[PDB]
Amino acid sequence: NIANKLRVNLGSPTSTVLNKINESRRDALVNYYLAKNVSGDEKIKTAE
Amino acid sequence: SVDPFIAIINAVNTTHTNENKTSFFQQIFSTLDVDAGFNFLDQGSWEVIIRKALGITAEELLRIAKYCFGKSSISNVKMNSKKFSQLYRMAMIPRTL
């Protein structure tokens, strides 16, 4: 609730806060994709 | 420009055209539905996005919904593209000034 309604007048799609949102989201998504759900036959462990 | 002036006088432009990706309606109101139910007598999840667009507070949005619909049918409103003009009109005349 609080995350959906702190987005009301703050976090506009033309700002810099949403860039930090995306930077914190990619660090979760890349590590989670390294954790699960690739073709596991290829040795994919790091971000490179 | 043409689209906010139209949206002041008449329906917000909902036709996706040969522009970049989308229409003026999805450019301003990020994700809503023309001809959807809006219980803005109480609240909803649209109430975040309308304040994103127009820049209104809560009670000023309630007063701006008291006008342009009357104090009888605030609850069950099926807002087409012409009813969003009733909200864009009364709240973009101040901010362009």
B48:A8 CB<8 A: yes
CA distance B69 to B31: 23
Does B94 contact A at CB distance below 8 Å? no
Cβ within 8 Å, pair A4-B55: no
> B52–A4: do the CB atoms touch at under 8 Å?
no
> How far apart are the C-alpha atoms of A28 and B4, rounded to whole Å?
39
Q: Which residue, B10, B4, B5, B8, is CA-closest to B24?
A: B4
Output phi, psi for B36, to 5 deg. Answer: -125, 160
Minimum CA–CA partner of B27 in chain A? A13
Hunting for tokens 């999805």 — which residue is that?
A: B26
Residue B87 neighbours by CB distance under 10 Å: 24
**Which of A8, A14, A17 best probes binding to B when mutated, by most B CB atoms within 10 angstroms?**
A8
Query: What six digits make up the tokens of B92?
Result: 């973009």
Resolution in A: 3.2
Report d(CA B69, CA B46) in Å as an integer. 18
- Flag whether residue B55 sits within 8 Å of chain A, measured between CB atoms: yes
Beta carbons of B55 and B96 less than 8 angstroms apart? no
Q: Which residue of A has its CA nearest to B54?
A: A9
Q: How was this structure determined?
A: cryo-EM
